[PDB]
Write a protein that binds this ligand. Structure first.
Ligand SMILES: CCCCCCCCCCCCCC(=O)OC[C@H](COP(=O)(O)OCCN)OC(=O)CCCCCCCCCCCCC
Lengths: 50, 42, 307, 35, 37, 307, 35, 37, 50, 42
């Protein structure tokens, strides 16, 4: 019936949305995390220098 | 005819039997939405 | 019987564990894949083990598009279920009557193909390991078994050498006769556990010979050898570099190919993993990348995971 | 000049003995890093 | 015709059982040899 | 004359750089690839730039298996030579008579196909930019031109807006009349240079309209729409995240395909890079990984690179 | 219900205008991380 | 047949030159328009 | 002649060995470099704590 | 075969010409093997 069609359409759109979101976000997550780690390391270097 | 009746119910219901038993053994016993959600939001 | 205990013999490993330390630890055959893969598994309980898993994949033949799974492992019972898109259902149940005797049942239905289930019964005594596997057991109207039967026995001759057999009986329909096959297994563990040799001579004529060496606490190396008239052979050498940040596995093949598998643990939870392979006799490549996001379900377990 | 299955089994056997001699030798001990 | 394969299979199984028993008792013969050593 | 200088115009960039900010700087069309790719470039002299480069690749159709190249660049001259396996030499020579007038010649052999060359003459005045390019010039026995020529002009009507044209004449053989096509070009720059807009109508009926925005000092974004009876259109929206350690470019398309490209500089010399694209209209993926190794040629530059 | 080339031209133009509004809007400013 | 093609190519080039000249003179006309308003 | 065949064979084998070496080395080199950096930072933390 | 000589020269000598220019304008002036080597052996 229409219930099965709605279910499969919703599942497929959820799957594609999740794949796009994580594929575009995980590189962002790791690059931004590395940048933040470097910034904090630099800040503690300044703190220990002064 | 018993096996034919079991064919669909066992198919659809092997997974949430395990889910229910783990939930019963789980200390805090979260709800169904938390159980299926991959987020750590608890 | 008293003189049996007087020999201080040790229990040999299971037959499935005969060459686990090479074909699973050092080599990347079971870990390799292709295309992109994301694994999203979370742990709800530890002391009674209970955890779920979502798996998204794309571009890989072996893996499906989406697969959900959930497992529970208590002190003696182990249950696992897996539901896959197109609604394929797999289930595993291991029940331990005792630390030595264990029963297992594996069920798999593809929803359009005959259900395939296998019954496992294993017993690991103080000196010998025996097990029996039944694939699609069935009895004819005359009372004759129909299916696949495997019965394997491994006995430790000396605390540094174990020798054993594996017999298999096949009865496809009952009208056609059931074939029988016998294979020989041998395993030599070093006196200091530094290196291991393992050789199997199967009933079809093929021979498998593997050697494993623990170079250091962080490095392992191994050679595996397969050879099946029509006779063809292969020799694969490999190494595993295990650290407290990342793991690396690299193998050369005698068929002129090279492989690499590097799992890089960027975060305590998030862990990226890359794998590549170059085939020189054909000049092709195979690339796979993916992530594992191991999360939690309880706040205290969040604290434990984060430290 | 044979070019027979015996030849490929002999080549494979040479591969196995060379590999086991390599691993058991201190060559791979030197190959692994000290750290 | 199939009968020949039947008895070939049963002798194969009997031989497998025989070597299994021999392997089961093997540590005693090895102990005798090391006693001789 | 005097009033022309009193207007106080500025020189707009050449026609080739009209979509520089949104097509090359932000979008990953030029940087994307497939399979594995290793680049190993070393530099000998810096003030007169001189460097060599080796490139290995496997799994990509566009890229060759092995390629070598060298380039030299003094104050007013630029030269580059390239050699590829199957021996297809390429060569580019740009001589700058002044800082404004540049004559450049590009040549590429194919070793089995007709060698193709192009010649460009570029003039950049105080308030307009002209360039004339020819591809495979040839003269018939009657002295008439036979080839492809493109002459483009861009004049800045106001300090924020530039309008221009390009005219292309193609004469394939001379027996068949050559065809002419005129294209219109528009560019707008915000007063604070916050955003750029560009729009060009092509001779083939294609319309390109692209907007670029500088969100912050480390990120920027762009959106581009192209249109081409048979009418087909597409629109891509992308973003760039530049950092001192990594560079990211992401892109959604109206065709349904998404793409990401991350170049991560692990070391001052090494720089790995990954690119991944997923198309949901056929559920397929492309993965590509590679490394860039930058090296010095003399001790002074070697210590300069590290610090 | 037209399903014509005008339909795809209109959809592409609407998508372009919506993207321009989104990019010019402050929403895409907060989308950029502050650091 | 091709004569009309040559004429239309020639007139396209002619209008291209015309609009190029108009574009070159355009900044002054815009300045005068601004002066008027 | 034989010179061209020898050159082609040598170049092809050099290419194969070089690509194998770098494919099996670059992941190893980056992993071991990250481990060495982590060990150095841990040693620095230990010495500043002591 | 002067025509074929120049034809093959225009192919085999364009890269050496660039290398010659770079070597002449550089200060260290290394040997050909180091010029063609991707190693940092300097
Ligand atoms: C449908 C759902 C799809 C899910 C898709 C999910 C995509 C996630 C993929 C993320 C991959 C990001 C790649 C990258 O650049 O990450 C680098 C990563 C970790 O590096 P770190 O940031 O920890 O480095 C710190 C200093 N060592 O390093 C690594 O992990 C190692 C990568 C090494 C690459 C080496 C390439 C080999 C060169 C081959 C050359 C062959 C030439 C013929």
């Amino acid at each position: 019936s229409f219930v099965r069609n709605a279910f499969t359409k919703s599942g497929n759109l959820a799957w594609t949305l999740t794949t796009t979101a994580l594929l575009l976000g995980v590189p962002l997550s790791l690059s931004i995390l590395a940048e933040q780690q470097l910034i904090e390391m630099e800040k503690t270097f300044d703190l220990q220098s002064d | 005819k018993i096996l034919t009746l079991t064919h669909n119910v066992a198919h659809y219901g092997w997974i949430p039997f395990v889910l229910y038993l783990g939930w019963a053994h789980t200390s805090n016993r979260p709800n169904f939405l938390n159980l299926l959600s991959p987020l750590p939001s608890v | 019987h008293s003189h049996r205990q007087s020999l201080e013999l040790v229990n040999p490993g299971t037959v499935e564990n005969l060459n686990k330390e090479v074909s699973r630890d050092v080599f990347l055959s079971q870990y390799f894949f292709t295309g992109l893969r994301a694994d999203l598994n979370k742990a709800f309980s530890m002391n009674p083990a209970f955890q779920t898993s979502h798996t998204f994949s794309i571009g890989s033949q072996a893996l499906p598009k989406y697969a959900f799974s959930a497992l529970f492992a208590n002190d003696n019972l182990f249950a696992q279920g897996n539901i896959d898109n197109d609604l394929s259902v797999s289930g595993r149940l291991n029940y331990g009557w005792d630390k030595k005797n264990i029963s297992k049942v594996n069920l798999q239905i593809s929803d359009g193909q005959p259900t395939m289930c296998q019954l496992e019964q294993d017993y690991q005594a103080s000196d010998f390991s025996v097990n029996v596997k039944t694939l699609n057991p069935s009895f004819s109207e005359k009372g004759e078994f129909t299916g696949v039967a495997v019965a394997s026995f491994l006995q430790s001759v000396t605390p540094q050498l174990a020798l054993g057999l594996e017999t298999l009986y096949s009865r496809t329909d009952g009208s056609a006769p059931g074939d029988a096959g016998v294979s020989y297994l041998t395993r030599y563990v070093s006196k200091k556990q530094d290196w291991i040799f393992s050789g199997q001579l199967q009933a079809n004529g093929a021979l498998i010979a593997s050697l494993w060496r623990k170079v250091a606490q962080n490095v392992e190396a191994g050679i595996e050898t397969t050879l099946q008239p029509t006779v063809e052979g292969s020799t694969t050498i490999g190494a595993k570099y295990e650290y407290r940040q990342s793991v690396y596995r690299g193998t050369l093949d005698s068929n002129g190919k090279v492989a690499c598998f590097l799992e890089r643990k960027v975060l305590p939870t998030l862990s990226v993993l890359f794998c590549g392979e170059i085939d020189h006799f054909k000049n092709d490549t195979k690339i796979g990348c993916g992530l594992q996001f191991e999360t939690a379900g309880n706040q205290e377990l969040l604290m434990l995971q984060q430290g | 000049f044979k070019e027979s299955p015996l030849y490929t089994i002999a080549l494979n056997g040479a591969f196995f003995v060379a590999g086991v001699a390599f691993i058991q030798s201190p060559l791979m001990d030197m190959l692994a890093p000290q750290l | 015709e199939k009968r020949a394969h039947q008895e070939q299979t049963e002798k194969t199984l009997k031989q497998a059982a025989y070597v299994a028993a021999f392997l089961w008792v093997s540590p005693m013969i090895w102990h005798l040899v090391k006693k001789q050593w």
